[PDB]
Amino acid sequence: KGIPKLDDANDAGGKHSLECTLILTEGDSAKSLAVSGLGVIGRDRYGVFPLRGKILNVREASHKQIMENAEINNIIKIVGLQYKKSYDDAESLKTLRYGKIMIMTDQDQDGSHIKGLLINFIHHNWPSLLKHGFLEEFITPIVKASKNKQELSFYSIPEFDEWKKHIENQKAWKIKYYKGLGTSTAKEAKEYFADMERHRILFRYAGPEDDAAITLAFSKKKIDDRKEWLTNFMEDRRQRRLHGLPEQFLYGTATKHLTYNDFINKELILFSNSDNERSIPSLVDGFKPGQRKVLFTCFKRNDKREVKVAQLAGSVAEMSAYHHGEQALMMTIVNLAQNFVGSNNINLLQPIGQFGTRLHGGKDAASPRYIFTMLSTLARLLFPAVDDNLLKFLYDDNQRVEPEWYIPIIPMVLINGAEGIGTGWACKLPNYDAREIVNNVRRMLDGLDPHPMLPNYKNFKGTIQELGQNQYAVSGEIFVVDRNTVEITELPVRTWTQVYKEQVLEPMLNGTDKTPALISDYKEYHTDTTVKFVVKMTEEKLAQAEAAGLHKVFKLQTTLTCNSMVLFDHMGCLKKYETVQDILKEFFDLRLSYYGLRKEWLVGMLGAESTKLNNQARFILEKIQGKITIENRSKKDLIQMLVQRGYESDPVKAWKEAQEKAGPDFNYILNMSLWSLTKEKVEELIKQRDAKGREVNDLKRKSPSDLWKEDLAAFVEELDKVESQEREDV
Amino acid sequence: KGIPKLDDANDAGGKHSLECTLILTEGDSAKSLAVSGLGVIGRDRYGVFPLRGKILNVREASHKQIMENAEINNIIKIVGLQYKKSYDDAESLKTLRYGKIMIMTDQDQDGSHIKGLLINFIHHNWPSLLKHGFLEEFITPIVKASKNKQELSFYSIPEFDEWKKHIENQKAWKIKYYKGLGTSTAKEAKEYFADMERHRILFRYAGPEDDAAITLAFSKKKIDDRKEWLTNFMEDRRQRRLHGLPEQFLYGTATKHLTYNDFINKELILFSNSDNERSIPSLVDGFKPGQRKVLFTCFKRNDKREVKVAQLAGSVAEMSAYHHGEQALMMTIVNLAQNFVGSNNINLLQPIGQFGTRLHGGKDAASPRYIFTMLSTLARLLFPAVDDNLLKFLYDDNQRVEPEWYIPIIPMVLINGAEGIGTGWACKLPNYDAREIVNNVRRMLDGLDPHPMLPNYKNFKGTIQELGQNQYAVSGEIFVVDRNTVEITELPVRTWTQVYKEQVLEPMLNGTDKTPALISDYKEYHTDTTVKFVVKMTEEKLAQAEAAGLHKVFKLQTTLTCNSMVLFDHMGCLKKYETVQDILKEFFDLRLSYYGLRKEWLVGMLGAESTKLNNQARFILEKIQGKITIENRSKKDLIQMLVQRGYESDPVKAWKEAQEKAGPDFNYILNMSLWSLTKEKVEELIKQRDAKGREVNDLKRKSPSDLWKEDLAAFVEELDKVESQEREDV
DNA sequence: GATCCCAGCGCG
DNA sequence: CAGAACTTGGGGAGCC
DNA sequence: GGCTCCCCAAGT
DNA sequence: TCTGCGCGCTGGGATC
Ligand SMILES: COc1cc([C@@H]2c3cc4c(cc3[C@@H](O[C@@H]3O[C@@H]5CO[C@@H](C)O[C@H]5[C@H](O)[C@H]3O)[C@H]3COC(=O)[C@H]23)OCO4)cc(OC)c1O
Ligand SMILES: COc1cc([C@@H]2c3cc4c(cc3[C@@H](O[C@@H]3O[C@@H]5CO[C@@H](C)O[C@H]5[C@H](O)[C@H]3O)[C@H]3COC(=O)[C@H]23)OCO4)cc(OC)c1O
Ligand SMILES: [Mg+2]
Ligand SMILES: [Mg+2]
């Protein structure tokens, strides 16, 4: 009572509170759908309460959070739950305003995660409820297929695709993908709320195995157990996909009672796998799927001018089949466009606007709807357009979307860092200098040894020295202008100016009860992206600090550990790495292989186009001398005699025929302007034919090692000037 | 103290509170710029407080609002203001935590409106403060022009354009339009906060004339005085624009002290005029400028599939120079796409999604970002694409944007109504039936008399009877199924089902202290868009209701008054109308004139294209017979002899030359595929040439009255089937 | 020695 | 993702 | 007989 | 227009 979002039932806390089944719904769309279904089901015994998204993990959080969490307190009040109270008897159950709890949400993985979090919360706080079938879920269809009047509902993508791949005609039906609850109309809620048999599963507790499964899924202690469990699941899925064995979808016709064991080990695990795919990047290009979609859309659009972040995000959502949320796209844009100190070393997207500074580490950026960006010319250098003809593209809803992974010239993952936070894994890879990497890979090309490389950050004046394997020390710049004055001119990585100031200066300037005052005053001269602290203190205290160490006193040093080199290899698998050299070698091997493939593809395409140009030259020369006559000629006879004259059909188009497989057409010669009959056009066409004839041999006489050199040479050719322009303005 | 958004000065309520100048800035962007300038100006004497948008009009509101208004209470606490306290002495001034108040906002009209509202507040509550120069404004430049190193700042559009039209080369400078405060970077705030002399004006009180001006601007009593004041200003502006006399911008070099009189009568009046343009629609097409921009962008895009509302709104903002706000575009889309009962009779944009129902009158619509729409085929019928060649298009920032006003076949304003709330005027025009209007205009075309017409609403089962000039009665449908049971099957216009139910049934079902219970029970059977109330009551009470009148008792009748027919005529002037017939006659006259113009334009274009086709036929016929030879021929000599042979250059392009004014080119007779030398293409070209030769005469033998007939015939031809499809599904 | 809290990012 | 004030004028219903 | 409050829409 | 919680893992700094 008194909670604004309470669409409670009539019998709330009444005589029949054991029959009042509150519906838990994440989202206002789900709340509206429940309200629409209330007309069918009535408001006497059903109450509606929305959720805020994802809930706190009580087993993983502190008691202070539990007390201070609004949503847990609200649900406890509404159900009538009591702290530490045991509910293993019906007399205590009568104290609750509601009898049963029903959960319903999207059919995607995040909904399963929400069910899992609710299960964990209930089991941790009041496990005995599970013994009485306290929880049920309202499933909703995810796919609807239409044929005339017949409508088929599919609750699982696997069974839906099984049905789809067993139809005489896919076009005989229209398929609608219900990837949410806002898509469903209020009218469909009538059908949803008219069928409890098809839309109600009950969480039937089995035994201690369910408790063990929940603990495995949610106890922070069993992280490594989660790692091995996910690895076993991944291996099983790999075996299934390499053997073609279909899996057993849980949403069966007779499926009405579900154990927590199957829910945890069958669908929440699918969410864990999806989260791992979302978060942990790929070794091949260092792009999480969201970033890959962003870049694929930016390439397809090929925008030549400024575009608003929201507009580009909407374009990404529409032409790349992104189905998670637009604000995530806005965050991805603002992350990939950041270029200040400690952020991305290479800014693929130009930050035309307030994208954040060292003051807050990108948390002070302007709103993402008044900031523009455009493709920096560097990115196209990293991913040559010609290379795209080899990438294995994907299909979502029978639409052409992003490839599995892009292919750059330089290993992108070890350039701009990687901060991925999966489930059962993680990834924290620092930055490196681009020129050092390109020199190392050029040396590797020549057969020399790869020089060991140390992490570096763009325009980072501080020095980093390795103190051990995957163990480095980051240190700022401290100077002593005069005997009782010091200057800070550099800060460690991930040490924002505002946070460092507020956490260091005044906590130590005036001090606390535990630590007295140290310094007297400080003056800051902060430029756009540089820190200049001038601190004056008592002479003796600065002498003590020098005795104690200037870096040690001011906390201008920090430890960086990189014991979590976990990436996705070329063949789509999770792999933990040890040092940079292994990743560099793997990238080198794959890049050589794709140079082999692209040389073959380029030589084939160039041969086909040279053949086409030679045919065009032959035909125009025949026309000039009058050997060919088409004036007032029938199309069929003309085509027949051209075939008999020794002309081949569409070599360029015929070239694409060999690509996809693994009457005759002469439009290309015939779709030519009459200007071609002028001598200047003839000379120009002959010139182009000869140029292509030279160029095909020039390329076929090269080697894959040769072509990489100009890739790096061109990449570095204008890398300096833009970086010079990055400093010439400043 | 304790207000979260307070960046107060150090001396807040201290010894020198008379020197603490709080800054009032609407927008978090303006707050951020103020914070950036705080570094230059120091936080000792300056405090920062942001606005919430637009503030309450204290002179026009009740005391309950004043007590319950968060903005006013917060600002009163921050300044230390006291109710009913007089501040006409320095001793009372020292009770205030702040000495001066500075106002800073955008340079557009809304900023002037915010200054006006603040002035009204201060004058109404504590006028004596104005006698002591209590208020000052911080102006910011609106246009920045760049040339190499020189930068010029312009604070007023008039002076900026005066400078612009007096330059040897506009491209010698780059112009940036600072149409906001988020555009300005923090670095520019340094320059802004370094120059008070150029960015500080003080509100110097003059006398009772200032008080009279404020009262005129803000007192609800002087609405008519505002009407005549605005009319006089409009007449003066018309005289100036017809005589070319420039106006005197107050943003002068020596301008440092400003009187409230000038502020009211030279800028805030401009905001009133702009609001009038925004709100009061146009006579010709009933589109406010926002709706016109939406339709212009929708036509240019010519989207053939569903598009998200947010995506289309962003497209509007970028390709139509809209510079107000995206949420306004979302509201405009959701308004123009609405099609339920009582809403738009004609839905130009198909509402593909939950756009709202009769339950809440469009206030229950889904999220503006989860809903799609696309151009209904009907709209293109109203605005034929060929007609667009006559509209006078506009230019913003030297970019091609929407025209002044579109020409439809039917008068659009009297079709979907008009609900505009301007300043000093208003407009409320109800709906009408399309078929009735088209029949009336067809009769007007034949010289007959225009039948008087009554307002009608699409699918509105209720009946409307006129009770006087601009005075109508709207009545629902109530029946008596049995002697003690009634059924309501229709509600008056603008009477939403939920609002009517909550305001009628339960205030009368159970009654109040003043009125006891009347009915016993009610059951509703509400379909998608129909109301079905079945009410059972005591027999004697229903007998009394029949004695008192069934419509009267249930409030199923309402009065509609249309004494505010105020529109914008073709010449862009405000005009108050009396009845529908005058508007119809004006639209009829302008539409006949534009048919005359379009007939002339079409005959000219058709003649030019027929000439071009005849030239192409002559050339190809010459080529077939060999009279013309171009094989291996020089371009220059070929062009010369073609000129001498009697061929003219680009008649279609030459046709456009005459349009814009109020060497020879032969690509069109040369840019054809070699298929043109085949006999089939020759026969086809002859067929088109002859068809155009027939068609030009067929059109030139018609009359403007004729061409309208098929416009209406085609419009009605498929008007029924879509309306039939609107009901066939239901 | 040991526990606790927080900052990094694509998501609900 | 969602929910939150005000403007500006006409006119209609509902209280005293 | 009269004052008061609210709904309508493109904007802060 | 803005502003508000939680996730999931690693590891580092502070506090006891
Ligand atoms: C908090 O920060 C600022 C707020 C504002 C106001 C504002 C102010 C409000 C308020 C709401 C609004 C809101 O308008 C609302 O938008 C909604 C957008 O979605 C649709 C569904 O419905 C719209 C509402 O019909 C409209 O009323 C803002 C949108 O555009 C604005 O200009 C509005 O309710 C409380 O007071 C201005 C600023 O600087 C100029 C700010 O910095
Ligand atoms: C109110 O209605 C609902 C809210 C939500 C949550 C949510 C919940 C919150 C909360 C915040 C949020 C918020 O996340 C924030 O997004 C921001 C988007 O712009 C940028 C600038 O910054 C992002 C924040 O980094 C992130 O924290 C929502 C955005 O997308 C969501 O899914 C979020 O703070 C309090 O609790 C889910 C629902 O159903 C699934 C709802 O019905
Ligand atoms: Mg979902
Ligand atoms: Mg503005």
Author numbering:
A (entry chain A), B (entry chain B): 457 to 1118, 1140 to 1207
Structure paper excerpt:
Human TOP2 proteins, including the two isomers TOP2A and TOP2B, resolve topological stresses during DNA metabolisms such as replication, transcription, and chromosomal compaction. TOP2 catalyzes both positive and negative supercoiling as well as decatenation. Taken together, this study suggests that activated ERK2 phosphorylates TOP2B to regulate TOP2-DNA interactions and favor transcriptional activation in IEGs.
The resultant EGR1 fragment (EGR1 #3-3, 50 bp, –30 to +20 of the TSS) was used to form TOP2B-EGR1 TSS complex. The cryo-EM structure of the ternary complex was determined at a nominal resolution of 3.9 Å. The structure contained a pseudo-symmetrical dimer of two TOP2B molecules. Although the density of the ATPase domain of TOP2B (1–456 aa) was observed in the 2D and 3D reconstructions, interpretable maps were not obtained in the 3D refinement probably because of its intrinsic flexibility relative to the core domain. Therefore, the final model of TOP2B includes the DNA-binding and catalytic core domains (regions of 457–1118 aa and 1140–1207 aa, respectively). Both of the two DNA strands were cleaved at the active site of each TOP2B, and the DNA is bent by approximately 90°. Two etoposide molecules were intercalated into the two cleavage sites of the double strand of the EGR1 TSS.
